[PDB]
């Protein structure tokens, strides 16, 4: 009697497990349907040489999938070799998070963000940003309690999602692997709580998209992301009071 | 008495030198202001194992900058080590070109696209796609004359440009390096002759963008790209008759 | 009123979570106190060239720690570089598991064992073998149900533990990181359900051990391991009926 | 009616384009027939640790070919892997140029020489030295104008050429690729304006050479090189007045 | 009339050639039957950063086999790639030697131990430790004569051997390659002159061992090692007077 | 009363130890004064793909120095990284030996030449060729006895030496390390028993050489090499009868 499946504009089940593991300053396991990512935030009291003494901090991200995160085993990036996909994804995650951090208020420190995918079924890079934001704020909460910053140094909430145009379905939100593999167009969107973009990346896959479709895709991603931000706020509990 | 400089919505000087060098199936030097890129297309009568026997072709791209392409010398990616930036750029160029190739009509062959930047002043990745399209079509023209394909296997023209929101200037088109380094938002846009998108990638740099701005940025990129396509047609001479 | 801490000859809390993740043929999360390891078993219908056509199978293992598995962040082995410690650990895990597999009954297939440490507090390599055994048998159960083997191709149960001689404590079982870092002697022991050894590795750390101590250390490891095997049997449920 | 081809002792067409690109201290495109090499000279106000504080400068060279410089595409040395041929060639170019620089007069600075081959048809390493000398002197001219050196710190002019013994032709000067591939003996010669050698490298290819032939080969290289030096002087214009 | 071959509990011919080569502080060629290893000890007046200023020294070891050390040529570990076997062996040699060095008395210096195998017929890692101990003491003798240490900074003699359980032979000592390749169990033992262990590593190869067998194997290794120590003392000549 | 030292035109002590080690088809230790190199020749019944089915064989060489071959320890090329010097040297050794092998008579087989330097005091690359020739002929003798070739497939004897112009000494033959480090000019010469060259490589080191000096240097190398060939013949014993 229950409706089976998801509507075109409906997220998979989202669960954000906070203080997931003990050692990081900030630790999260994010579940987006079958996609599962361990996100940690590590605080180092150093910044890269290129910016030392300038009084601003930095955020840098690393990404990997455990070999059987995927249905078909993947070759370990062991040192093995780092794929272009990993490199692109790392750049995306780091750029996205830097955009919402008040780097001056962070002070001269680096946030090392690690996103390790333990199960992959689509949307890993955007799940990674969504989980890593929370992990970062959990770390920022510890700094604040330690009196090492005067506020949580974030300018807003930040979350991310995929959207796509899928064979015989049209515009769909939060694609699983099966859906992305038969998507004509796919897109990653990274947005703040005030509805402002930090990153938009759309790709026609052997195919093309109109501007009408771009607007459609974005519309759908915006609401997915506002919902994700609601969930981040659910996960963050009282910490939301330390953010404006 | 002549107006100095460029309007906000004006491209740098664009020059596409065809049959630039002798050995490639297709060879171009593209100049976009001070940005200069050698683009070759190489035809190999093989496709990757993952798709062999399926009767479709493939396009794959490589990118590098000679060490003093840039004002400050860059460390050679010698084997040295391949940067995330290079890997992202290669993925972009290959995805963009694959989208406009009729891969079945190409047959089981790979187009190896090489983009070697000899002078860099912003917009190298988009200059690379713009030049590489022409290099690819020059190669496709040779195949056609050789009776190895029945038409030039392209679905449209394809070109690319950057756009950005720049401190105290607002929306500007085709950013040089100086302008991109003080850009709050920058964007790469890849579009066809029919005004359809193949790739859109926008990044807030320590900052964010509204949807209004996204539409503005896109508007400006569309016309830059239609102009670039006009120039590609200028460069292509009679070959335009072999394309629909 | 409750006794705090552990006796010298007492394991940390052991928990073996079976069918932990969806994609592997066999999946386990093993917890040994704060030490936590994701263990998967992947079946490939191929063996290495050096033994192809000989009708026997193979087991091979890979190991990694996520960067903040540890209290102090570790540099990612990304491709980064693979440490001697990782290489030694992989060799240990693979050798240990091969010893208890009936490789002829497995047929010509490789078991790929992946051990990804998500939290490290000592005993990761032995926790890895203990968890990976179960993951492997879970995979062997699927093969059997699929009629691809005639029995679970194991010759016995197999588990592993550390033991050590610790400053001002003497012989202690299952060392955490703190305890191993002030251990004069440490040892890894790998044993079967019939009390037979597959691997024994003892190291004096800036110090030495007598034969009396070796016997003592082994005695203590044997019972730790019999207890671990009891727990593996608890985790395996009805599958124990398919093993002799 | 015009004689087709080249005499045995005749260079290909030589063209040295100065101030070729904007960013280097010294920039040249050298053309030797179909062989074309972009040569830059970059000044860094540092020397290697092994010689720091000793008041002498250094010259170091890097070499690469763009993938379709060659008739058959070459695999990119991307980081891919650096070939022995590249390593030998780099050593040759750097040794040759160091020999003619007054390193004390240079002061404690490194000249980074980059030789990127955009079209290859034989003689790339010697074309590289010939072009790179000019690029280096163009850089030295800028230093002098900047009052950072008291003279152009060169001890002489320097140029280089190949010579060979070719099936059914005997001793020939400046070999193209076709001619080198059927050469029994080939040789690289590096000489100054005063007729003094900096490097001589002769190789019997599946074959051997007499001393008579060595003298013959050298005779022919000497005059090729004096001609090349004349052309370097043509390219250098008024700068020749700043050299003795 | 002479008995051919070796008893089960008998070493191969052992020869330790001291001051073998000129450049190292300590140089040995050790022969164990056909197994031959060049062992050098190099003194560097530095320790790793992780322990600098703490006043203790360090020992670190490297291992390689020349390509035709083995009956079947091995691929050179050139940079090629370093095997897990090499990494494990290096760790073993370094750990073993550190255990018998008085690191405080050494002072803040590193002993670089190099073990290059020129002929391999089993027992290379244990031959390496046995030879490297002597090479190290030869180096320590030079330091002492130079008044850079107040005694030879060793706590004891140290040597090593393999033992195994071999098809149709039972417990055998010092296995050649042929014997190890049909060994059900093999073991490396590292012991001091006072009969105390520094390392014990036993591996069931597709098979298992009882505790009775472990004791048997150890018994046999102890006497092999006492014999090896006698030979080290033979090789060391008068230097034995500088050790307690 | 004995004259101390060497004349300007005199080799160091040369010793060629044949059948040095057991496993190679051909094995030599060559001593040239303090320079000592283990040279092996390995026969593989395969040639590279680029020449398969063409009925000719191949020779390829690898070179390394053990870390304390040198007075100052060298970093191991472990996989560490392969130096340009090693790559150049390998190319030299392989080219030199190929020139004197009848590759058709060899048949479709590769000779793998390994040159491992155990002590370095100048002239390692030329010592390597001199020793490796003998190792190769020892291997060719085994092939002949096995009826796998119809003659020793060499066209002549081949040996090599350095020569140099040394501060306050002029032209000197067979330079040690000290002498090469204060050499204005150095040269490697590779010659056959009939006085024909296979390779000549001369380098002015911060300095230049005249043609008169080139002739002088060569004269001196020729006689050094004829002497070396005499010694190779001494080492080869009766095998000289199987060569013309």
Curated annotation (Swiss-Prot), chains A, B, C, D, E, F:
Transmembrane segments: none annotated. The keyword rRNA processing applies. Keywords: Nucleotidyltransferase, RNA-binding, rRNA processing, Transferase, tRNA processing, tRNA-binding. The keyword Flavoprotein does not apply. It catalyses: tRNA(n+1) + phosphate = tRNA(n) + a ribonucleoside 5'-diphosphate. GO terms for biological process: rRNA catabolic process; rRNA processing; tRNA processing. Phosphorolytic 3'-5' exoribonuclease that plays an important role in tRNA 3'-end maturation. Removes nucleotide residues following the 3'-CCA terminus of tRNAs; can also add nucleotides to the ends of RNA molecules by using nucleoside diphosphates as substrates, but this may not be physiologically important. Probably plays a role in initiation of 16S rRNA degradation (leading to ribosome degradation) during starvation. Belongs to the RNase PH family. Sulfate ions in the crystal structure may represent the inorganic phosphate substrate. NCBIfam families: RNasePH (TIGR01966). Homohexameric ring arranged as a trimer of dimers. This is Ribonuclease PH. It comes from Bacillus anthracis. The lineage of its organism: Bacteria, Bacillati, Bacillota, Bacilli, Bacillales. The gene is rph.
